Design a binder for this molecule. Structure first.
Ligand SMILES: *C(=O)CCCC[C@@H]1SC[C@@H]2NC(=O)N[C@@H]21
Ligand SMILES: [Mn+2]
Ligand SMILES: [Mn+2]
Lengths: 134, 603, 580, 36
């Protein structure tokens, strides 16, 4: 779980992590650098945490992967989570046959739906309240 | 008629406040600088590149952009150290070419190019590159004195520099070694040997720079450097205004509005106060260069060196050893970098009790031809003691340097947003990495400027303030013992702290009456005026005579008192007509303008 | 040919830069060296020193002259005297001038530089005759200035008269640094043709031109030049003595002077001057504004201090605008003592008052009534009226109207004055001299002491630095603190606390050796200049109840050592340096 | 009430209802907001 932005040729996304809720429940292990409020220094690598998922088999794991990635909630900095969800979605991967070329051989993986930030929705609402009150 | 270049925006603050001037303090006054008829303004180059990055945490390429935009009509001038550029070492030819290209592209119009050793092989690429880009190349004789330097030596260098294709030739007296006599002859001998206009740049430290400029304009110098008066003199250059005033009326009259200059000077006078913390312990005329030619400011870094080691008592020795080492290394000019080199080696030799028993690695490189051609021949026994039989290279030291531009760009892929970022890296890679990193994270934090009155409080109570405490709470007491600084960069400064003999680093970041003007009485006890019949002085002093007794009838205008103030007598006279009710003053008394000295009842 | 040099350190130097506050005690230690340089003369006494010695230092200026005379045997001492004005701000009766010169001569003085603000040479003649009478050197002074009325011939005409009075030398006194080098060449030429006397240049440096001005002068045959030792030189002062000497070495004008001896003396003064930090003024540097407000160098650090005492430094810009306007009002007199105090003080009044000539000093009134002499140009009639009304302007040499008062004065001070000198001290400033003589005879003098540059600042001033709220980072955590036994808020949780009190360069290099943990040094295993390889025991430290050896990060040469046995260290400190 | 809010390339159709809490419809998706 690197603090980079895959949309922008994986450019680093250093800065402050405003909110962080750690993933949990079964099959889930976290090994984190980061925490709530942590400010990622720019002199080192981008890795804020390693998320490590486990299940009794291939199908289950992948599902649990997808889950745990969402389960990991991180505001303030662009992360590779969304990108990973694309990988886990893609059938060649689920099918469990792949080699070093898989990423290169599938650039589409970075062209994904970037869900609109809850930090922006709150502003849009607050502006509706401002225009409604005076 | 003489043209004038001002150096405020570069050499001025470089010479007097350690190159710490912000670009923010430069722009407000730019439209006026642009309005004066300056030949050029020295805006970029020298130590500013380093300082902008190292301490101000600003991108020097930005400063050049902004200054170029705010000084449209004026031609911007930079100082470049040949193959050394604005850096520490020689650079490969492809980087010199790229640098000059980017400096030109982004604003620079005039390039003053000099090399410490005067080894003109080191300038050629720069000069060809400046000519190539269609800009002004000012080739620089960096002046010094020694058995080898004489006027022909310099005119020979000036001829070569003309032959390389220079538009102007510059005399750079970094250490204020020109005497006015020499400066007349030299400029004469240069006007015969070269067809180019000449540029005098004479620092003021010895007191002769203004006399030196006079002799120069007498003998046909075309352009002269000065600094605006608030930053002028001493380690800086002669005051721009003073030059202008000394040529008004003459055949050399510079067409310059001395009052406009004065306005700008006042602006800078204000700015400079912010930078009090970088002012040099030694201000003004440092004649010492004139006993034995050791640059003042060389002796202030040498002493700064010896103090930290507890060894100031050896300076007299070191200054005797300095010229011997300079001689050993063939009378190079004592500028950066050669001055550090010589000075530190000299210190070693003294401490060791033996000449060249121990040898600085930079001295070795000097002796291996790495910096260039020593103006005189080096001592062979010293070379051999230091460097043995080893390869004294004899070519132009960039000859040994593979093209590095492609190499660097790869080294900084994913940081450098631009070619300029790559050239910044080139100058100081370790430092530029952290900078580029901090910039792209929006995390740059310039060293904040201190407030003068606040620092002085904390330092006076610094030997006095307590450290060992006992702190009691929740039943418990804790023995605490602090250590280390919190008055010199305290947001940056971390204590170390011992809780019951367990020491942990702490860091602190700061987040931040009974005085009565109101009272009826002045400090002295004497009443302040209640009403308008109360007689007052408008400036303090001592009473010479009271011309009136406790009850008298007085009409407005009557001499009631006399005071001496500013050594002058003044008869205070009655504001109002009527009766003298009280008199709260005797002959001899010292009085102040808020005190009421007599009272008078109107009508 | 050879140029002679006078140094002004002991008078004009500190008068121009630290408000005339230099003590005699700080002068004597370096006198034997001053005596050893080949100075033409030393300017030791006169000008504002008389006033300052009494008013502020509480020393008898006659004593200073005695001591300086004794400590500078081989050198000829020089004083500055303001003609009838002597060392005051008004004209004195002829019998007091004569008596003063007699006593100054008797007690040491060799050369008398005599000048008059107005240049009304009628005012110098008694002084010059009295100096000649006593068999001493009279240097008559053109006090230079600029205005629509002044020009070179005007000055050479004054030089001719001064030769005719029997002067040994003629002096050009550029008090306010108004000479341009061009004028100075022409003027000294035109003077060398019109007079047979050696010429003495005295050019304050405020405008930046004084050093160029001196060059042109020596080119055109000037004989003697004033400089100030470098520690007190430049700006409101004079050009650096050393700089002059260096700029003539080798030439036909070579002054025979040992620039290293000079430097030694300069260094002495550099140290002394630090004591006087409290009298230093922002306004003593190069300022080309002087070419118009025309305030003289000897004046400005005194004026500045004077405004400071009144809380009115913020008004200087105003005062300097007002000055040239009052000067015009009074017919373009040269701005020298005492005209410069007069104009300057009046200007100050006007500014403070918010009104021009609402208040008028008595000395301005006397000026307007012809009592200082003939104003070179015509005075503003409306100003005269506002100040002096219909009253009449005398046109004679104002001392003509002054009764001999010497015998009168001795009687006035019978039972105080211990000596004739004490009577002349009285004559300069009776009110002041009375209190002084009284306080001296009672052993009760109290000179304003010099302030300690860093006195321990009071407990009430320390608190405006101290913080109420701040962020403490302790062991990875930071904690927001707000203090108010203290009461203390840790992350918005307020807890009573009680306290009981109990009574080096950072590394630039990777070669700079550091501890990563603070402690005390037990042993340095290395001397400067050693060759060291990575992994060599370089230091030992005590920390955590143990001693342990720090070893070299890098190979190469030990360049410095910033630590000795016994020292306490912290990890940001660089303990030695090593060159790779 | 029936607002259109254009924030940063996007527009959003908002409709409010009502320390006390609104209920708020972003592009026909209603949920509870609380202001203090
Ligand atoms: C008080 O005694 C301080 C000195 C008085 C002012 C000085 S006197 C010489 C200077 N000339 C002048 O007009 N004012 C200055
Ligand atoms: Mn320079
Ligand atoms: Mn003077």
């Amino acid at each position: 779980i690197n603090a980079e932005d895959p949309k922008n040729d994986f450019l680093p996304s250093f800065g402050k992590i405003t909110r962080y809720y750690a993933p949990g429940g079964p099959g889930i292990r976290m090994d984190a650098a980061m925490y709530s409020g942590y400010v990622i220094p720019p002199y080192y690598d981008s890795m804020c945490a390693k998320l490590t998922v486990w299940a009794l088999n291939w199908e289950s794991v992948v599902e649990r992967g997808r889950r745990a990635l969402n389960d990991t909630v991180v505001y303030g900095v662009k992360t590779t989570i969304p990108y990973y969800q694309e990988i886990l979605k893609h059938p060649d991967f689920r099918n469990a046959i792949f080699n070093t070329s898989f990423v290169e051989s599938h650039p589409e993986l970075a062209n994904y739906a970037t869900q609109f930030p809850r930090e922006l929705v709150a502003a849009a609402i607050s502006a509706a309240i401002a225009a409604h009150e005076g | 008629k003489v043209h004038v270049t001002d150096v405020v925006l570069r050499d001025g603050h470089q010479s007097l406040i350690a190159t710490r001037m912000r670009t923010d303090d430069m722009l407000p006054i730019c439209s006026k600088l642009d309005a004066v008829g300056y030949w050029s303004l020295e805006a970029w180059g020298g130590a500013t590149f380093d300082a902008c990055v190292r301490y101000l945490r600003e991108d020097p390429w930005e400063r050049l952009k902004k200054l170029r935009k705010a000084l449209p009509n004026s031609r911007l001038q930079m100082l470049l150290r040949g193959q050394n550029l604005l850096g520490y070492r020689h650079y490969s030819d492809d980087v010199v070419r790229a640098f000059v290209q980017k400096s030109a592209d982004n604003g620079i119009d005039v390039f003053r190019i000099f090399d410490a050793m005067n080894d003109l092989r080191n300038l050629k690429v720069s000069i060809e590159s400046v000519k190539a880009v269609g800009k002004h190349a000012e080739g620089t004789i960096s002046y010094t004195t020694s058995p080898v330097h004489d006027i022909p030596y310099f005119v020979n260098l000036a001829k070569e520099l003309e032959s390389f294709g220079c538009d102007t030739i510059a005399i750079k007296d970094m250490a204020s070694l020109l005497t006015p006599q020499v400066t007349g002859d030299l400029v004469k001998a240069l006007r015969e040997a070269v067809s180019l206009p000449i540029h005098l740049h004479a620092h003021a430290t010895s007191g002769l720079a203004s006399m030196s400029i006079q002799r120069a304009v007498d003998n046909g110098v075309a352009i002269v450097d000065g600094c605006i008066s608030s930053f002028a003199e001493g380690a800086s250059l002669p005051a721009t205004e003073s030059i202008v005033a000394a040529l008004k009326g003459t055949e050399y009259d510079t067409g310059l509005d001395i009052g406009l200059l004065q306005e700008i000077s006042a602006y800078f006078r204000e700015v400079r106060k912010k930078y009090w913390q970088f002012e040099s312990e030694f201000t003004g005329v440092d004649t010492r260069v004139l006993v034995n030619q050791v640059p003042g400011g060389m002796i202030s870094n040498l002493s700064n060196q010896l103090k930290e080691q507890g060894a100031l008592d050896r300076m007299d020795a070191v200054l005797d050893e300095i010229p011997r080492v300079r001689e050993d290394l063939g009378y190079p000019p004592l500028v950066t970098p050669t001055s550090q080199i010589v000075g530190t080696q000299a210190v070693l030799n003294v401490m060791t009790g033996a000449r060249y028993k121990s040898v600085t690695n930079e001295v070795k490189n000097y002796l291996l031809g790495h910096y260039g051609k020593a103006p005189s021949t080096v001592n062979p026994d010293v070379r051999n003691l230091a460097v043995g039989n080893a390869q004294v290279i004899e070519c132009r030291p960039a000859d040994l340097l593979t093209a590095e531009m492609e190499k660097l760009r790869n080294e900084v892929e994913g940081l450098a947003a631009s070619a300029a970022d790559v050239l910044t890296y080139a100058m100081f890679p370790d430092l530029a990495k952290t900078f580029l990193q901090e910039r792209n994270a929006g995390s740059l934090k310039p060293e904040p400027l201190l407030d003068k009155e606040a620092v002085t409080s904390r330092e006076s109570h610094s030997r006095f303030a307590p450290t060992e405490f006992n702190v009691t709470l929740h039943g418990e007491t804790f023995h605490i013992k602090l250590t280390g600084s919190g008055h010199h960069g305290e947001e940056q400064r971390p204590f170390y702290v011992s809780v019951d003999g367990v020491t942990e680093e702490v860091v602190v970041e700061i987040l931040n009456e009974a005085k009565r003007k109101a009272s009826s009485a002045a400090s002295s006890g004497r009443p302040r005026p209640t009403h308008a019949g109360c007689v007052t002085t408008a400036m303090p002093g001592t009473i010479v005579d009271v011309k009136v007794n406790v009850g008298d009838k007085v009409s407005a205008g009557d001499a009631v008192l006399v005071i001496e103030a500013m050594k002058m007598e003044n008869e205070i006279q009655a504001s109002k007509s009527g009766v003298v009710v009280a008199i709260n003053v005797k002959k001899g008394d010292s009085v102040t303008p808020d005190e009421a000295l007599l009272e008078i009842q109107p009508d």
